[PDB]
Design a protein around this motif. Sequence first.
Motif, PDB file in Angstrom:
ATOM      1  N   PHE A  18     -29.724   2.885   1.973  1.00 49.97           N
ATOM      2  CA  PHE A  18     -28.981   4.134   1.935  1.00 49.97           C
ATOM      3  C   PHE A  18     -29.660   5.109   0.982  1.00 49.97           C
ATOM      4  CE2 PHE A  18     -24.708   2.059   3.226  1.00 49.97           C
ATOM      5  CZ  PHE A  18     -25.142   2.038   4.528  1.00 49.97           C
ATOM      6  N   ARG A  31     -18.588   0.466  -4.749  1.00 51.23           N
ATOM      7  CA  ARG A  31     -17.978   1.640  -4.135  1.00 51.23           C
ATOM      8  C   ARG A  31     -17.030   1.246  -3.012  1.00 51.23           C
ATOM      9  NH1 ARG A  31     -17.729   6.894  -3.362  1.00 51.23           N
ATOM     10  NH2 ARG A  31     -17.618   7.691  -1.223  1.00 51.23           N
ATOM     11  N   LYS A  32     -17.428   0.282  -2.181  1.00 47.12           N
ATOM     12  CA  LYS A  32     -16.537  -0.199  -1.133  1.00 47.12           C
ATOM     13  C   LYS A  32     -15.268  -0.782  -1.732  1.00 47.12           C
ATOM     14  CE  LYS A  32     -14.816  -3.342   1.890  1.00 47.12           C
ATOM     15  NZ  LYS A  32     -13.926  -4.500   1.618  1.00 47.12           N
ATOM     16  N   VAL A  35     -13.111   2.322  -3.260  1.00 44.67           N
ATOM     17  CA  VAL A  35     -12.628   3.385  -2.386  1.00 44.67           C
ATOM     18  C   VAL A  35     -11.641   2.878  -1.344  1.00 44.67           C
ATOM     19  CG1 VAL A  35     -13.360   5.068  -0.705  1.00 44.67           C
ATOM     20  CG2 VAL A  35     -14.655   4.794  -2.781  1.00 44.67           C
ATOM     21  N   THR A  36     -11.902   1.715  -0.753  1.00 48.82           N
ATOM     22  CA  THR A  36     -11.123   1.259   0.392  1.00 48.82           C
ATOM     23  C   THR A  36      -9.645   1.152   0.043  1.00 48.82           C
ATOM     24  OG1 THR A  36     -13.055   0.003   1.112  1.00 48.82           O
ATOM     25  CG2 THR A  36     -10.954  -0.488   2.169  1.00 48.82           C
ATOM     26  N   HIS A  38      -5.560   0.287   1.209  1.00 47.77           N
ATOM     27  CA  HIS A  38      -4.635  -0.448   2.061  1.00 47.77           C
ATOM     28  C   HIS A  38      -4.354   0.330   3.338  1.00 47.77           C
ATOM     29  CE1 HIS A  38      -1.228  -2.747   3.413  1.00 47.77           C
ATOM     30  NE2 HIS A  38      -1.189  -3.487   2.321  1.00 47.77           N
ATOM     31  N   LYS A  39      -4.581  -0.317   4.483  1.00 45.54           N
ATOM     32  CA  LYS A  39      -4.506   0.387   5.757  1.00 45.54           C
ATOM     33  C   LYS A  39      -3.090   0.822   6.107  1.00 45.54           C
ATOM     34  CE  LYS A  39      -8.488   1.191   6.844  1.00 45.54           C
ATOM     35  NZ  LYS A  39      -8.701   0.783   5.432  1.00 45.54           N
ATOM     36  N   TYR A  42      -1.514   4.958   4.828  1.00 47.55           N
ATOM     37  CA  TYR A  42      -2.440   5.455   5.837  1.00 47.55           C
ATOM     38  C   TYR A  42      -3.408   6.503   5.304  1.00 47.55           C
ATOM     39  CZ  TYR A  42       0.444   2.937   9.160  1.00 47.55           C
ATOM     40  OH  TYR A  42       1.120   1.951   9.836  1.00 47.55           O
ATOM     41  N   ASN A  43      -2.909   7.678   4.936  1.00 46.95           N
ATOM     42  CA  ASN A  43      -3.770   8.747   4.451  1.00 46.95           C
ATOM     43  C   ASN A  43      -3.608   8.992   2.959  1.00 46.95           C
ATOM     44  OD1 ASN A  43      -5.650   9.979   6.300  1.00 46.95           O
ATOM     45  ND2 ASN A  43      -3.891  10.567   7.561  1.00 46.95           N
ATOM     46  N   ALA A  65     -12.033   9.904  -1.996  1.00 55.82           N
ATOM     47  CA  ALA A  65     -13.107   9.828  -1.019  1.00 55.82           C
ATOM     48  C   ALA A  65     -12.606  10.156   0.379  1.00 55.82           C
ATOM     49  CB  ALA A  65     -13.751   8.445  -1.024  1.00 55.82           C
ATOM     50  N   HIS A  66     -13.437  10.874   1.131  1.00 58.15           N
ATOM     51  CA  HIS A  66     -13.141  11.268   2.498  1.00 58.15           C
ATOM     52  C   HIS A  66     -14.410  11.115   3.322  1.00 58.15           C
ATOM     53  CE1 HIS A  66      -9.435  12.999   0.797  1.00 58.15           C
ATOM     54  NE2 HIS A  66     -10.231  13.455  -0.152  1.00 58.15           N
ATOM     55  N   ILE A  67     -14.267  11.234   4.642  1.00 57.52           N
ATOM     56  CA  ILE A  67     -15.386  10.947   5.535  1.00 57.52           C
ATOM     57  C   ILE A  67     -16.503  11.970   5.356  1.00 57.52           C
ATOM     58  CG2 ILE A  67     -16.061  10.917   7.959  1.00 57.52           C
ATOM     59  CD1 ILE A  67     -13.793   9.290   8.658  1.00 57.52           C
ATOM     60  N   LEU A 148     -23.049   2.256 -12.317  1.00 58.33           N
ATOM     61  CA  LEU A 148     -24.050   1.249 -12.641  1.00 58.33           C
ATOM     62  C   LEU A 148     -24.058   0.880 -14.113  1.00 58.33           C
ATOM     63  CD1 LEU A 148     -26.985   2.723 -10.550  1.00 58.33           C
ATOM     64  CD2 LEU A 148     -25.632   0.709  -9.974  1.00 58.33           C
TER      65      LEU A 148
ATOM     66  N   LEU B  26     -19.320   3.485   4.620  1.00 62.60           N
ATOM     67  CA  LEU B  26     -17.918   3.450   4.224  1.00 62.60           C
ATOM     68  C   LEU B  26     -17.003   4.330   5.060  1.00 62.60           C
ATOM     69  CD1 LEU B  26     -19.561   2.484   1.569  1.00 62.60           C
ATOM     70  CD2 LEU B  26     -17.472   3.168   0.377  1.00 62.60           C
ATOM     71  N   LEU B  30     -12.769   4.224   5.762  1.00 67.33           N
ATOM     72  CA  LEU B  30     -11.983   5.419   5.508  1.00 67.33           C
ATOM     73  C   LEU B  30     -11.191   5.875   6.722  1.00 67.33           C
ATOM     74  CD1 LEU B  30     -14.539   7.438   3.360  1.00 67.33           C
ATOM     75  CD2 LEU B  30     -12.484   6.262   2.589  1.00 67.33           C
ATOM     76  N   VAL B  32      -8.367   5.847   9.637  1.00 67.62           N
ATOM     77  CA  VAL B  32      -6.942   5.556   9.559  1.00 67.62           C
ATOM     78  C   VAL B  32      -6.465   5.180  10.952  1.00 67.62           C
ATOM     79  CG1 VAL B  32      -4.659   6.508   9.142  1.00 67.62           C
ATOM     80  CG2 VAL B  32      -6.528   7.004   7.568  1.00 67.62           C
ATOM     81  N   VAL B  66      -0.484  -2.905  11.578  1.00 64.26           N
ATOM     82  CA  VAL B  66      -1.420  -2.444  10.558  1.00 64.26           C
ATOM     83  C   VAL B  66      -1.132  -3.211   9.276  1.00 64.26           C
ATOM     84  CG1 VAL B  66      -2.419  -0.475   9.389  1.00 64.26           C
ATOM     85  CG2 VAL B  66      -1.401  -0.172  11.627  1.00 64.26           C
ATOM     86  N   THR B  67      -2.145  -3.890   8.751  1.00 62.27           N
ATOM     87  CA  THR B  67      -2.040  -4.705   7.548  1.00 62.27           C
ATOM     88  C   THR B  67      -3.016  -4.175   6.499  1.00 62.27           C
ATOM     89  OG1 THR B  67      -3.379  -6.303   8.780  1.00 62.27           O
ATOM     90  CG2 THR B  67      -1.046  -6.795   8.496  1.00 62.27           C
ATOM     91  N   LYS B  68      -3.195  -4.945   5.421  1.00 60.50           N
ATOM     92  CA  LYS B  68      -3.969  -4.465   4.278  1.00 60.50           C
ATOM     93  C   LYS B  68      -5.397  -4.111   4.668  1.00 60.50           C
ATOM     94  CE  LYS B  68      -5.960  -7.348   1.784  1.00 60.50           C
ATOM     95  NZ  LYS B  68      -5.906  -8.679   1.125  1.00 60.50           N
TER      96      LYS B  68
END
Lengths: 292, 159, 172, 33, 208
Positions: A18, A31-32, A35-36, A38-39, A42-43, A65-67, A148, B26, B30, B32, B66-68
Motif C-alpha cells: 500500500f 488501523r484495521k 477503525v473497524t 461493530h456492523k 451501522y453508520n 474514518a470513511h471510504i 508506529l 479497509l 467500512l 454498511v 447483522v452481527t459484530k
Amino acid sequence: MQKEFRTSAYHSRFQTPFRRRQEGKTDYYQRKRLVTQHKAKYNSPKYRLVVRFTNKDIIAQIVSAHITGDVVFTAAYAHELPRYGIKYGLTNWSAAYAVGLLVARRALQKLGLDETYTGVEEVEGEFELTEAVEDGPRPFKVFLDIGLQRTTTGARVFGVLKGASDGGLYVPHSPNRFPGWDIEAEELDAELLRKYIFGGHVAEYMEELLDDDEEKYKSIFKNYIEEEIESEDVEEIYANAHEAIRADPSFKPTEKKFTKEQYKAESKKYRQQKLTRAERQAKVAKKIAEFK
Amino acid sequence: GKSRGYRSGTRYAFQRDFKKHGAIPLSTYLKVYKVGDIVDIKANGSIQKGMPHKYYHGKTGIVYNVTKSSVGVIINKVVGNRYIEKRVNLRVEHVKHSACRQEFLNRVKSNAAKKREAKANGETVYLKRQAAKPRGSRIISTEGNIPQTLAPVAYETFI
Amino acid sequence: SDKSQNVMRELRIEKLVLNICVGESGDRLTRAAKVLEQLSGQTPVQSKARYTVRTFGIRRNEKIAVHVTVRGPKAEEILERGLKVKEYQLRSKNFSATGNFGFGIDEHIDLGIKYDPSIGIYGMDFYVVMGRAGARVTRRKRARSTIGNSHKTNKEDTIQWFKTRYDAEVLD
Amino acid sequence: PSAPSREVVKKNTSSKKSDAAPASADPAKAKKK
Amino acid sequence: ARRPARCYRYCKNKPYPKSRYNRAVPDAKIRIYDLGRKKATVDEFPLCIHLVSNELEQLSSEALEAARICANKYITKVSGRDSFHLRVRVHPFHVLRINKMQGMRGAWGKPHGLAARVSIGQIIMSARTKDSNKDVVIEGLRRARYKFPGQQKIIISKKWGFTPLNRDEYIAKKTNGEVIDDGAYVKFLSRKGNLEANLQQFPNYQYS
RNA sequence: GAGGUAAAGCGAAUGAUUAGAAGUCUUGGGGUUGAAAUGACCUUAACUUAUUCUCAAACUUUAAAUAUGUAAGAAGUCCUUG
RNA sequence: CCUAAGGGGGACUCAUGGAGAACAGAAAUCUCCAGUAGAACAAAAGGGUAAAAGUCCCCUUGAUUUUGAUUUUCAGUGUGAA
RNA sequence: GGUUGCGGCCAUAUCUAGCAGAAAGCACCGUUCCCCGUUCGAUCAACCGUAGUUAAGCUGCUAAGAGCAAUACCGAGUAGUGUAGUGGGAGACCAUACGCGAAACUAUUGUGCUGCAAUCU
C-alpha cells in the motif's frame, strides 16, 4: 558469475505494498483493528485520538474514518500553545499534556458537552476515567492511535492520553504506561506523574544543571534565560496555561499574510514542468544526429 | 479412495488475485450492510474465519442478520426438485454489495421524476424498457465513399 | 547545490565490532568474554552455532563465539590501539565495497592489557562500520528509507579517509 | 557478570548442514605445491 | 519389445510428460536435433525448406531418429556435410504406456516410449541451405517422409533461413544496418530502450 | 456477479527442453610458459549476459464459447414523525 | 502430535547471493549491501500469511460455563468437523 | 501550488541512473538529569529547538530507461467454441450454415489521482 537479480520478470511480478505502507507511515494491521466498527452499529463512527510527534510539533487530531478518506473532527497542534502561555519546550511531556487537554476541551466545545464533563479540574496525577453522568448524554468516547510509535512507560503519547482524559473525553486506558508507574509494586506514584504534568522533570533538570555545568545550562536553557524564567516559576507556566486552555479552547487560525492564490502563484514558479512529447522526440533526434 | 472434504476442489476459487495478496483494503470494513441488502458472495482466501462453503462462492443473496463482524445471507439452493432456503453466516470480507441494486434503484428514481414532469406538462410518458428494435431506413452518401470492390484472395503459404 | 564538500557528508565511525570465535563452549568462551569485557568495558554477548559441523567440532545452538559492539570515542580508542599492533598498515583487500574495513590481531596482549596465565591469549577480530550523518534514515522505525547514492560509503572514500586520519598505508 | 546471548533471526528449524557447503568447490590451498 | 506404431498413432490421451508424478521414464531415441553446419551464419544459408505435418498425430521418437538419420545421410552424401543446417522441430515429450509389459483389473500401464504430438501445418523438420542446393535438400526430406506415418508436405519457405523475415524484408533490414550476427542466428535493432546502447550495438544504423 | 476448462504463453513465475554467440573463472581441469612467481596463454567443461528450437492432467500472467447466481417494484418509491 | 506447536501483546525479517574480518579453509562467528518470500508455519497436498500467520520475548489458560441457530456430507436423519 | 498529520483507491504510485529544490513544513541534526530500553542512548525513551545542514531522507524533473496502465482498420473475425446436415474423408481429421469470439504479437499514448484538517514568500 552470479545471476543478475533485478530482471524484468522481477519487476513484472512484484506486488508493491500500500502507498502509505511503502512510505512507512501507516500500520494497516493496527488501523484495521482501530477503525473497524461493530456492523450492528451501522453508520455510527469510531473516533480516533491520533497523536503524532514531529521533531518540532505535537499533532493531536480526533478522526473518524470513511471510504473517501479520514475526516477530522477537531485538531490541536503544539504550535498553538504559545497563544496559551507555553512558548518553549513545545514537545515536553507537559506540552503533550497541554495539547491533549486543549484538543479535549475544543472537541467538547464543538459537541456542547462543556458544563457537563468538565474533567479533572484539580490535576493531582491520580488515574481516573471520565464517568458518565446519570440521566445525561454519555461522554465523548475516543480511542488513542499512537501509530508506529512504541509503547513505553513514560512515553509522551500517553501524556496526550492523560491530558485528553483529564479534559473530559472518555478515552479507555490503564495507568501502567504513565511516568511514575511502579511495575514491581503495581501502583501509580501520582506525585511523580503530577511532577511530569507541570514540567517538574524539566525544572529539576534546570536546577540540577545550573549548579553543576553552567555553560551547558546556558546553551540548553537559553530561551528561559532571556525570558527570565527560573525553575520555581516553570510550573505556573503550565498551571496557568491549563486554566487558560479551559477558558477559551476555541480554534483561532493564524492570520495568513497572503491569500491562497498568491501562495499558489509563488510556489508554481519553482516547479519544473514535464516535457511535451515533441520536446523529448526532438531530444532523441538530436542525440541520434550527434551520434552521426 | 474418494476425498470430499469441506474445501475440496477450491484450489483456484479461493486463491488471491495475481499481485493482490496480503492485507485487505479497509473500504471492505467500512461498508454498511442492512437487513434486506443484496450482496455477492466471494470467499477471500486470506481470512479463514467466517468463510463460505464453495457452493456459495459466486452466489448472490439477501442479508437477514447483522452481527459484530458478519452478516447472515439467505441463499436458495436446488436440492432435487425444489429450492431450500440456506442461511449462511459470512464475515464481511467475503461479502460485497450487489451492483444490480444501484442500477434498478436509479431507474425507480428516474421513472418517478419523468412521471411527475409529464403530469406537470399534462402529457404522457412511457416508462417500460424496450428491447432493441430493427433499425429504420436510411440513405448512404457516396461522396468520398464510392464502393470498393473486394475479391477472395488466392491461396498462399506463409511459412 | 549538491556540494561534495558539505558538512554532513563527513565520514566517521559508526561502530566497531570485536569478534572472538572460540570454537567451543565453557571455560575458554567464558574467559574470552572476560577479555572482551576487559577491553571494551561492556558486557559482551555470546553467539550460538547456527548448525552442526563435525569437522569444526560444533553443534547447533552450542554457544561458540562472543562479540561486543562499541560506539563513540571508545571505539576510536580501541581502533587505534589495534592499529598500533598492525603498525598502521592495512591492505587494499581489507576494505569492502560498502566502505567498511577490518583487521585481525593474533594475540590480545599486544593491545596493552595485563596477561594472566589462567586466561591465556585469545586472538581477536576488529571490524569498523563506516558511515556519514543520516544513517538513522535506514534504521528508524517510521518512514524508514534508503540512503542516496552520493551519500553512500564506498571502498575508495574509506581508504582515503583512513590514510588521511591515521597517516597509515593501505598496501595495494 | 551478565550473560546475554545473540538471538535467533533465521527460520531454518532443521538441524542439518547448510546450503552451499560442498567439497571440491574450494580452490587448491596447496597450489604452490 | 515395441508394438507396431499403429497402436500409438492418435492423440487419444492427454499429454503425459515426465514429472514428479511419473519418474521411471526411458529416454527418447532422438537426442540430436541440429545437424549439418549448425554454426553457419544467417547470410550463408538463405533458402529454408520445411517438412510440414498434414496430420493431427503422434510421431514416435524412433521415427524422428530414423527420419533425421535418413535426411542427414542423403544430404551429406550428395552435397557434403557442411552444405546445410538441418533442424528437427518437434521434441517427443509425451510418454506412451504399455499394459501387458489380472486382465483389465489394475490395467494402468508402465512407460513404454516417447512421442511428439503434432498438429496440422506444424513444421517437423527445417533445413537451411543455399539456393543451388534446393533439389538435394528436398530429396533429403522426401526420403525422410517415408519414416513417418501420415501425410507430410515439403514446403519451400518464403523467409530467409530460420529467420521470421521474408527474403525481401531481411535484405531491407540488412542494407539498413538493423541486423547483426549472433553466431548461427541474428539480432534485430529495436526502437525501444536505451538509445545509446541501441546505437552502439548497431553502428551502421541509417536512422530515418 | 462468479469461474480457470478450450485456446494461448514460455526472449513471464515453476518444471521440462535444442543450438550456437559474447564475457568471467577470481571460487575446473589438461598442455605450454617459468631454474621458482598462480601471475598470463591454447583447449574443453562450467557459470553470466543477450538470444534460439520445442513442451505441461496433477504449470501459469492472460483467458473464451456453452453452462450458472441475482435483479427488473404496490410486500415498491418518496415526505412527515411514533 | 502440541501447556504450547493454544490465546493476547510487543519487537524483528526470512531462503539465498555479493563484498569484507586472526586461526577460519567450500561449511564455525562477526559486518555491510542486495534480497516479493525463491524461507518458515508438527505431520499429505493445495490454499493463506512480511511492521505477519513466519522468528524471538513477556503475560497467561477462552483447550472454560449454559443451552439454542447455522454450513458441509444430507433423507436436508445421525456422527464428525466448522 | 508547496508541506505536514490522518487517509481512499493500491505501481499511471514501483525500480535503476542522474539533476534541481525559493518559503514553510518535514528531515537529518545536539544532549543524557529525569521515565524507559539496550552488548552498544545505533534502534527505543526522555531533554533542548539550543550548536549546524539541505549532504541524505522527502518532493519534482530527465531517460528512443525496465516495469506498470490504457487504447486500437495491430494481430484477428484468427485460435477456440454453442447449434446443424443421410456434408467430405478408410481413418486422422476437415469444410460449410446460423451464432459467440480470445491470448500472444504489433503500434501508440501515459507515468498517480484524490478526501478531511492545519500551515506557507
